[PDB]
Every structure is written in C-alpha cells, then in structure tokens.
Design a binder for these strands. Structure first.
Length: 185
RNA sequence: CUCCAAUAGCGUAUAUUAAAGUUGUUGCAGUUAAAAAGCUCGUAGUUGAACUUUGGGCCCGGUUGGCCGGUCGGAUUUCCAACG
C-alpha cells in the first residue's frame, strides 16, 4: 500500500491519517500526479496551541523541501479542511551536531549548517514559509529573559495572519525561545 | 645673658631609599615651558572585526498560557507548565 511507504517502518496511526489525506489528492489529481508522487515526509508531532486549536508539524527529509515548497500553499488548504481544529506546517528534519569540547573530540569538522544556532534560524524561515523575514530583533529584558521578534513581509501575509498564535507555540516546543511576530507596514 | 630641639648622645661628610606622578606597568610629558623623525614605503616586533548548543533538587523575581473579573477599553495576583 502507498500509505505505508511514506512513514519510516511501522509507526504510526496518525501517520496514516495524513497519508490518506495525500492519496485523496493523488487519486483526484488535477495536476498533482506530476508533483505529489515523489513527495514524502518523515513524522508528525502534535503541538497544543495555546488556543483551542492544535498544530501539525510535517517533517521533510530535505533533499525535498524545495519540492514541498512548490505545492506548500495549496496542500495546506487540503489538509486544514479534512483535519479540523488543526494548523498544518512543514518543517525539514535537520541534524544538529554537538559543539566539540576540549575533551569531547571527533573526526570530520562540523559544518556551520549543523550548528544549533543555524538550525533554529532555519526553523523560523520554514515555519512561516511565504512572507520572507525582513528582520529580527532580540530584547534582553530587565528581569533576564530574552524575547525574539520576527519581522515579516507585509505582502501575502493573509495566508498565515491567523497562525501567528500557533507559530509561537510551535517554536517554543522545539527551541524553548519566546517569539513575537510583528508586521511592519 | 636668656631661650629652643634631641639627649648619653648630638653634629658633619659621602652613598643610598622615601620624598620623586623628577623614570611614570600601576603612573609623567611632547601647540607655545625640554621634547612629534621633512615625508612616504617597509622587514623583525607589537596589535588585530564578527560568527560555531541550555540536564540534580529546593527558595526568589519577573513573561508569556489559560482555569479564573472584581469592574465601570484598562484595575489585583495566586495553584500549575517551561522560559531563560
């Protein structure tokens, strides 16, 4: 069955639910047979948004995040209607290699793409996927906590304008860092 | 003659230390008092932008998230995450 060939080996029941959501468009197929055939994903984590909704995180192997970005906007519409009370987002399963200490040595020098401070930057670029980020500010409060601030492009913002409350919860669950989104005009 | 200072000790000479921020690492000065090479290149020497992840528990402050409005769009904070 083509449902089971997307997930890793066995798991899980939730991975099948999104798997059926793909083949209802692969078998409908206005144009999607030429682009949704090779697209496959790795896992779903369910993140509880602070409101009544929840968030779906789709993890992509990333030789194919560019492939997913072709149908990203259209596919999210056909995932939100057949999965109510949810917000669907697409992320890439990136690898983070630990910083070498003066004792914990390795072989094979660690590329800058594997550093943790670069992977978290690529999460923000991939959470919001349209509306390219036009800036970042970090507030160091008097108390001692740090609050980021992501400035988004004003054009095409109406595709994610409701999902700013969801994105702050997702990035907190993966990084533990506070985010506020601000849209300059 | 009287008085002062130290006193079984007191003066003199030379050296040296403090004084001396008058050798300056701490810590000098260089327009006119002494002192910015006529100017530029240049080796040694001295100096050189930014960037690469947060596991023990308990008490304290916030800042977000709600269970909570008390109230005529703002007014108190507590029990709970983790967020450093």
């Amino acid at each position: 069955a083509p449902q089971a060939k997307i997930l890793s080996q066995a798991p899980t029941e939730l991975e099948l639910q999104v798997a059926q959501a793909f083949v209802e468009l692969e078998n409908s197929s206005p144009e999607l047979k030429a682009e949704l055939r090779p697209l496959q994903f790795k896992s779903i984590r369910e993140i509880d948004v602070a409101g009544g909704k929840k968030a779906l995180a789709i993890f992509v192997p990333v030789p194919s995040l560019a492939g997913f970005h072709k149908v990203q906007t259209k596919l999210t519409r056909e995932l939100e209607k057949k999965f109510q009370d949810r917000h669907v987002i697409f992320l890439a399963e990136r690898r983070i290699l630990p910083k070498p200490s003066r004792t914990s040595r390795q072989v094979q020098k660690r590329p800058r793409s594997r550093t943790l401070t670069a992977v978290h930057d690529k999460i923000l670029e991939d959470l919001v996927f349209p509306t390219e980020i036009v800036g970042k500010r970090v507030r160091y409060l008097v108390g001692g906590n740090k609050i980021q601030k992501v400035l988004l492009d004003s054009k095409d913002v109406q595709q994610i304008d409701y999902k700013l409350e969801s994105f702050q919860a997702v990035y907190n669950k993966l990084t533990g860092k506070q985010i506020v989104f601000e849209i300059p005009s």
